Amino acid sequence: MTNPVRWLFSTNHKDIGTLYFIFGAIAGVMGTCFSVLIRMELARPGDQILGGNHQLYNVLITAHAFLMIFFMVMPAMIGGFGNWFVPILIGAPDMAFPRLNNISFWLLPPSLLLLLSSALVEVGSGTGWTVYPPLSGITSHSGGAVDLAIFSLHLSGVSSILGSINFITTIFNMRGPGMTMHRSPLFVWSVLVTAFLLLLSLPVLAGAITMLLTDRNFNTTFFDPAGGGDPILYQHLFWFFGHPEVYILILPGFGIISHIVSTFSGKPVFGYLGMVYAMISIGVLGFLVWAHHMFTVGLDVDTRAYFTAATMIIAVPTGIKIFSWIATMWGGSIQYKTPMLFAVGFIFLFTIGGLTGIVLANSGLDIALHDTYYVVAHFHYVLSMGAVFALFAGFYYWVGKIFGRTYPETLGQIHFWITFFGVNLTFFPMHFLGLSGMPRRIPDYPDAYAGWNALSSFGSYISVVGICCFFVVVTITSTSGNNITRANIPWAVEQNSTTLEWLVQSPPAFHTFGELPAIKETKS
Amino acid sequence: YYIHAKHMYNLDRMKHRGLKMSLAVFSAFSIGVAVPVYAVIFQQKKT
Amino acid sequence: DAYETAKWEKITYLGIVSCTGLAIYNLSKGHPHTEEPPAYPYLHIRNKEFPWGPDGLFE
Amino acid sequence: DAPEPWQLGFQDAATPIMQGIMDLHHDIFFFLVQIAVFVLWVLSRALWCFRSKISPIPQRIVHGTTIEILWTIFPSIILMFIAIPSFTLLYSMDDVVVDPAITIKAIGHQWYWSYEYSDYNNSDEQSLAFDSYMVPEDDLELGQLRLLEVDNRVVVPAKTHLRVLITSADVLHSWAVPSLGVKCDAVPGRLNQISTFIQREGVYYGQCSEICGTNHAFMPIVVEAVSTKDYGSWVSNQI
Amino acid sequence: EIKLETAPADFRFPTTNQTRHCFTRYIEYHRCVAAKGEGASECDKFAKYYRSLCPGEWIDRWNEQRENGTFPGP
Amino acid sequence: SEPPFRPREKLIEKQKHFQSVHKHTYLKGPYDKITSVAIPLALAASSLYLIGRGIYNMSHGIGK
Amino acid sequence: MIESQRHSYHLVDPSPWPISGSLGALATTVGGVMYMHSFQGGATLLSLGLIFILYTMFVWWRDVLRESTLEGHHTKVVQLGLRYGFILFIVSEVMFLFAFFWAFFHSSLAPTVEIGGIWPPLGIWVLDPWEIPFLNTLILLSSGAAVTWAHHAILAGKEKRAVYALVATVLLALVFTGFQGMEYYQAPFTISDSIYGSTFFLATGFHGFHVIIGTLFLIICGIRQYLGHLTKEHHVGFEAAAWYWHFVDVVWLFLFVSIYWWGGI
Amino acid sequence: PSVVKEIIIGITLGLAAGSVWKMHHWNEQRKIRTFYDLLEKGEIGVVVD
Amino acid sequence: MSTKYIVSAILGSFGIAWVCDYYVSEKKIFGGSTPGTITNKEWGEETDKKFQAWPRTAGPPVVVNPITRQNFVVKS
Numbered sequence A: 001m002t003n004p005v006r007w008l009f010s011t012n013h014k015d016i017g018t019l020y021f022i023f024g025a026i027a028g029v030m031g032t033c034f035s036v037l038i039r040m041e042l043a044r045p046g047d048q049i050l051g052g053n054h055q056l057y058n059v060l061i062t063a064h065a066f067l068m069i070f071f072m073v074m075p076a077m078i079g080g081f082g083n084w085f086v087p088i089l090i091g092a093p094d095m096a097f098p099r100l101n102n103i104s105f106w107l108l109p110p111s112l113l114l115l116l117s118s119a120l121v122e123v124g125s126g127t128g129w130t131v132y133p134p135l136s137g138i139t140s141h142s143g144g145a146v147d148l149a150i151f152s153l154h155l156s157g158v159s160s161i162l163g164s165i166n167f168i169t170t171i172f173n174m175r176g177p178g179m180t181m182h183r184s185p186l187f188v189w190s191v192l193v194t195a196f197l198l199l200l201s202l203p204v205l206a207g208a209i210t211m212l213l214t215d216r217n218f219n220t221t222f223f224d225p226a227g228g229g230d231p232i233l234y235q236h237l238f239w240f241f242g243h244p245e246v247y248i249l250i251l252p253g254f255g256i257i258s259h260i261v262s263t264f265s266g267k268p269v270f271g272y273l274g275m276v277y278a279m280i281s282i283g284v285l286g287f288l289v290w291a292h293h294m295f296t297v298g299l300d301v302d303t304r305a306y307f308t309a310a311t312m313i314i315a316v317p318t319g320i321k322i323f324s325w326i327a328t329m330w331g332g333s334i335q336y337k338t339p340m341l342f343a344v345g346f347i348f349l350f351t352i353g354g355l356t357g358i359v360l361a362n363s364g365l366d367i368a369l370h371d372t373y374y375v376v377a378h379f380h381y382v383l384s385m386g387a388v389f390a391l392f393a394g395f396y397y398w399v400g401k402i403f404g405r406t407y408p409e410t411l412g413q414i415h416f417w418i419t420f421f422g423v424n425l426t427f428f429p430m431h432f433l434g435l436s437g438m439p440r441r442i443p444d445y446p447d448a449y450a451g452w453n454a455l456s457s458f459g460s461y462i463s464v465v466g467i468c469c470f471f472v473v474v475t476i477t478s479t480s481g482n483n484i485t486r487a488n489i490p491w492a493v494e495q496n497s498t499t500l501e502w503l504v505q506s507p508p509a510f511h512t513f514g515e516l517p518a519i520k521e522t523k524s
Numbered sequence B: 001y002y003i004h005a006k007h008m009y010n011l012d013r014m015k016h017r018g019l020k021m022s023l024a025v026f027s028a029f030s031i032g033v034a035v036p037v038y039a040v041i042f043q044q045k046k047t
Numbered sequence C: 001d002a003y004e005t006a007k008w009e010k011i012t013y014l015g016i017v018s019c020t021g022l023a024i025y026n027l028s029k030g031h032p033h034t035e036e037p038p039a040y041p042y043l044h045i046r047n048k049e050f051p052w053g054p055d056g057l058f059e
Numbered sequence D: 001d002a003p004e005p006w007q008l009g010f011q012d013a014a015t016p017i018m019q020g021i022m023d024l025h026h027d028i029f030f031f032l033v034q035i036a037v038f039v040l041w042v043l044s045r046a047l048w049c050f051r052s053k054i055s056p057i058p059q060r061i062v063h064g065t066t067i068e069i070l071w072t073i074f075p076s077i078i079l080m081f082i083a084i085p086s087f088t089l090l091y092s093m094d095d096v097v098v099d100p101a102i103t104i105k106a107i108g109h110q111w112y113w114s115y116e117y118s119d120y121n122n123s124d125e126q127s128l129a130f131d132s133y134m135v136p137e138d139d140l141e142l143g144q145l146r147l148l149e150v151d152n153r154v155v156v157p158a159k160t161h162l163r164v165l166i167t168s169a170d171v172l173h174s175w176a177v178p179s180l181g182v183k184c185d186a187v188p189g190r191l192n193q194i195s196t197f198i199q200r201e202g203v204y205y206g207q208c209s210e211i212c213g214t215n216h217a218f219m220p221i222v223v224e225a226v227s228t229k230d231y232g233s234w235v236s237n238q239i
Numbered sequence E: 001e002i003k004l005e006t007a008p009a010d011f012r013f014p015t016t017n018q019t020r021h022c023f024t025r026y027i028e029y030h031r032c033v034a035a036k037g038e039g040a041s042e043c044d045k046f047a048k049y050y051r052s053l054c055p056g057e058w059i060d061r062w063n064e065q066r067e068n069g070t071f072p073g074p
Numbered sequence F: 001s002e003p004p005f006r007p008r009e010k011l012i013e014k015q016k017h018f019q020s021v022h023k024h025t026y027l028k029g030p031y032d033k034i035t036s037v038a039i040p041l042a043l044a045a046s047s048l049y050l051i052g053r054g055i056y057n058m059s060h061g062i063g064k
Numbered sequence G: 001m002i003e004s005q006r007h008s009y010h011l012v013d014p015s016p017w018p019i020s021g022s023l024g025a026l027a028t029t030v031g032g033v034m035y036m037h038s039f040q041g042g043a044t045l046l047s048l049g050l051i052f053i054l055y056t057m058f059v060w061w062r063d064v065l066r067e068s069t070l071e072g073h074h075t076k077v078v079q080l081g082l083r084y085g086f087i088l089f090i091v092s093e094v095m096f097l098f099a100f101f102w103a104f105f106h107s108s109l110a111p112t113v114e115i116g117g118i119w120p121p122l123g124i125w126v127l128d129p130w131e132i133p134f135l136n137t138l139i140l141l142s143s144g145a146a147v148t149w150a151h152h153a154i155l156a157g158k159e160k161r162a163v164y165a166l167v168a169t170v171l172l173a174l175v176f177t178g179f180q181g182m183e184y185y186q187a188p189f190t191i192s193d194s195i196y197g198s199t200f201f202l203a204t205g206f207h208g209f210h211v212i213i214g215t216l217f218l219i220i221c222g223i224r225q226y227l228g229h230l231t232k233e234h235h236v237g238f239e240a241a242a243w244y245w246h247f248v249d250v251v252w253l254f255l256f257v258s259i260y261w262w263g264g265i
Numbered sequence H: 001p002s003v004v005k006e007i008i009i010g011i012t013l014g015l016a017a018g019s020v021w022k023m024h025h026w027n028e029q030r031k032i033r034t035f036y037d038l039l040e041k042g043e044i045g046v047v048v049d
Numbered sequence I: 001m002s003t004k005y006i007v008s009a010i011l012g013s014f015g016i017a018w019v020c021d022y023y024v025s026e027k028k029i030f031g032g033s034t035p036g037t038i039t040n041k042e043w044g045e046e047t048d049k050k051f052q053a054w055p056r057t058a059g060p061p062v063v064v065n066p067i068t069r070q071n072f073v074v075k076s
């Protein structure tokens, strides 16, 4: 009974972080199973394993997208790493508003159950990741699957709003003594900025899908063509959510990568104020462009010109950040452990994804490339590579800390290499097919495109091997009979650390602080 | 209880910890790769 | 200290007096409805019948 | 014009729009391959010359000046250079100085298209209207493609202007033929205008690019560009 | 022998809403039919224009609505 | 200056009572025994059963 | 004691109200779907989940009040943090109603060809924007003035007139919701009408729901002030109520202006 | 280690790669231009028979 | 140290992925089908000979991909 109290009831931001990590792992495995099913269906032209029922294929793509874009990265960046390492790192006791922390995390699993039951009811939700109105209308679906999915989005959105309020008030109020705002590390800063984006944008998505719900069931005419109310309204609202949504899946990745590079280069982050201001500007300019996702729908020329300019301007600060990271490796005394491997892979593959994004940002190029696998390659590199590789880097770097044990090194490097090779083979032919011109979200393709989709299908199985290796790593870590040392790892042994969280204990005791840190603050 | 413990987890103590963690991770993987397959199996079991 | 409380007390009392007068004005109006409009296509649509189908809520 | 096995890059062009698209993508790719190779080179040289066995001393520099402003400014002029052509393409593609010569409505029904070259009829009821169904698997001759061949294709005179009014009747759709470089959305309420002008004869294939219900990707589009005399003969024969 | 001509490029609508172009042409033709009626030349001009522009389903639905007396707009 | 309609020593007695027990926050008081072990518990049990039955019926398309 | 804890922040003790509230939310959502589509268990499940959420929210606020009033765990810093959190919540609600206003405006600046290219659609008898809606604005304005009067009652050390001001405000808010109900019943057009009726009713309904929740917040603060739980120096519940009510009044002002004045023009 | 030398050599390699790609693009553009030039004023037609 | 192990494991991973691919899409241990357009093995033949002269509804046969295939008629 004491263990169920300690888990289902306790506030204890560290324990909520552990629960978030477990949920993130489960959701990730579910999403990868959906991805493998998609790849199995698309391996060869014709009906491969679905044997018809392209409706089920559309359901599969929708469920995969939701599972990994809402239940894998967000519960791992914000809930996973945020909950744990915001108050420990900032130098504070247990987080502000602990009950909000607990309610957000325990809201998530019912949202998962809603999403699966939406994929399971009478026929399914074959409407894509971005639920568009007329297809999700009651004339064309009439199931209830879309209702269940919309409520899933409501629960996830409410949970993330609660978490965002938690993090904003904690950073603004719950800091230590003497610690000015410009001494909180970049992980804390990225979590602050991403929490502001999550607080401001997400309610618009809630309004848009509430409006879709009352269009379906309670028989309004917001997105019914007869009576005004064009679907362009829903496109505008959902994407005004959508782009702040995608500059949230990567900002905690940026923070973690900055920390990893800083701790591996023997030197702190070059151009600290540059990093901070660039990240704030990315947050701000994530809002001023939202229709660069709908160039081919019929906006006038001036809006297209403006959104082109806005996407270029949002491209600049990421360049400042990447060049700053390259600079803060010019010092020396690097050491190629697995977190450094994954940070380096993050930087390289995110560079590739960002350049493709620039290619896509123009108007005419988006006219030619809208809804083709060029876009799929763009956001699979960016999102998958960036977010997931930052996730793995953080996971190694701080499983040095959570459980108290340490992974075996050869298996860590083996997993990095397997996953890198597989997931970089399986997504570049997407670029080539998108240039050729195949439309996105199709179960069958003309015979011409069958050349590469056999090769890309060869890439998913390598990534499955990589994930299985990763779980072998996690189990051998949780049963490794050899605790944290100096020969194994040189991080936690530091008697002097740039970040506060390495000089505490193997796991934090229960309050993470017998007594709060101080700051000398000279010039008496 | 272990609020007043030197380590929040103190994972070493439990009974050999090996079978327990192995089953834990394997059941996590089973729940991760069972429901997604089961949804497709049920949909084909339907019309 | 208390002058502010007195002043907002006075203006809230003024507000409720004016509001009660205006309520007396608005009530006692018969409110006779005009004729129903011709059934334009965009009026009285039924995409999916209500659970309490035949007539909308509040009717 | 048609998709090719093991193909790299765009298909062939039959529209000044598509020429502009190819040129713009090539300029963008030139600038961005420069960017990517430079970044990869600097990252590699930073990782390799400081690899824990040459420089075991961190060297401790944290504040930088007159180089931060340099990588803030130089990407800006790079963006200016790669946004000079895009704006020119937009504002030279929008203008339609010439009058369109025909008008081809393309109503995007649920899982099949329809067309009406309505500008030939003396009455109000429209003549020359048909449906564009995908040919099933067993209804093919030995040559045609799979799920991309259509009954009663779109016919269009070549080397003369067009104006296609995309719209839908059931749900969202998109008229998308890549060889012409034409992609636009048919939203059930609006009537989007596309002005195109083919330059050579032959057939061009394309598909739907938007999630319609279940037979998505089985809702293809075929446009023939034929000589004006033959187009006249065909229309007079179809009336 | 065929005509090979259609509606011109109107200065008022440089955007991509020939939905407005459709409605405008329809209203002008019916303003003809109401006021002039015997301006057969100019009003056949307007008729040819909206026939070229408006899709058949829209034209038929609007004609039936106009007969029924439930045609929104002028 | 007027205390609001209570002696304010009843509140002090209640403060003494609450600070003079050795339990968690949500179990203090005799009211909370009944409340926070019977009402939410049975209520959540019934909610869980109805949720399960509803998901089952919706998935199987029975009991319209 | 603080001298052993060494920091003035708040450390709460475990409570199952997070998980219980989440279960209530799942009950409410599945009941909502099962009532939206005709099913046997729909209405009862939806009602049960809704009362579950109400109950968990009640015990949660009861627990917070119990801690902070009798245990005395609130120090100055957590007192400030509560204000921070509630301002953030108000910002979120502002963005939500902004999304709704955007829906209205995008549907009403350039009306489509299919409602005549005009606004309001022909055959929708717009309310005179001056008979009932003006009275509702006056009622909410007087309610805001009364809330300010209550705040200056609490601050000035006069802790008796605070209940008088709060009860006056609750009466005005009830009058407002009654007149909104009368407007709904006497509406010359329903929700299933054109985009005009649809957006009007959705926006106005959510505004009225926010009025209900703000009113009940004010009722809670009134009961607390009658019981003596609030003091001149240490009161956050009342400050939250005042800010929320000012939010509701401002949203109503924007709503009245845009919809009732412009839409009828 | 010389920072300016490394940045100079990086810019030079970037320009070399861009020049190679631009030569490719120029050859492709010339092919398209000569094809259409002939298609108007040359033996080349497009219909087989 | 471990480059032997890492490279060996990468090659083993490629082997396992190949085996799974061969069982799941070449022999279909999970039920499925193959198009009639690929098993005939003479369809591509006619597809290429038809890129030489693609049939048309109104007019003589006409070519496709004229540039990227360098196939086109002469003076006539």
Ligand code: HEA
Pocket: A021, A024, A025, A027, A028, A029, A032, A035, A036, A038, A039, A061, A062, A064, A065, A068, A069, A072, A073, A076, A128, A129, A130, A376, A380, A383, A384, A388, A391, A395, A419, A423, A426, A440, A441, A442, A460, A463, A467
């Ligand atoms: C989180 C984002 C994310 C991720 C990671 C992935 C991962 C993958 N995706 Fe997904 N995908 C999307 C988001 C994502 N996808 C979105 C948004 C769409 C759009 C849907 C639509 O357009 O409607 C899409 C669509 C999409 C399609 C097109 C569907 C269609 O066109 O019909 C395809 C095609 O194969 C595809 C393939 C893959 C593959 C092979 C992977 C592989 O990379 C599998 C992932 C591999 C991993 C390495 C990640 C798993 C990691 C773990 C499980 C460990 C977790 C660790 C802890 C948390 C501790 N994706």
Ligand code: HEA
Pocket: A246, A247, A249, A250, A292, A293, A294, A295, A311, A312, A314, A315, A316, A318, A319, A320, A322, A350, A351, A353, A354, A355, A357, A358, A360, A361, A362, A366, A369, A370, A371, A375, A378, A379, A382, A383, D035, D039, D075, D078, D079
């Ligand atoms: C995951 C987060 C993420 C990130 C970081 C980005 C990055 C960018 N994206 Fe991405 N995008 C998505 C998420 C993301 N995107 C998603 C999910 C989709 C699919 C949506 C859908 O299904 O419809 C999509 C698709 C998408 C589209 C097409 C949508 C459609 O037409 O189909 C566009 C075009 O406007 C676009 C724009 C951009 C731009 C301009 C950037 C830029 O910010 C990229 C910036 C990065 C750099 C450019 C690299 C670093 C810069 C340098 C090293 C300096 C040198 C560079 C210059 C010279 C400036 N994105």
Ligand SMILES: [Cu+2]
Pocket: A242, A243, A246, A290, A292, A293
């Ligand atoms: Cu975007």
Ligand SMILES: [Mg+2]
Pocket: A296, A370, A371, D174, D185, D209, D210
């Ligand atoms: Mg599109």
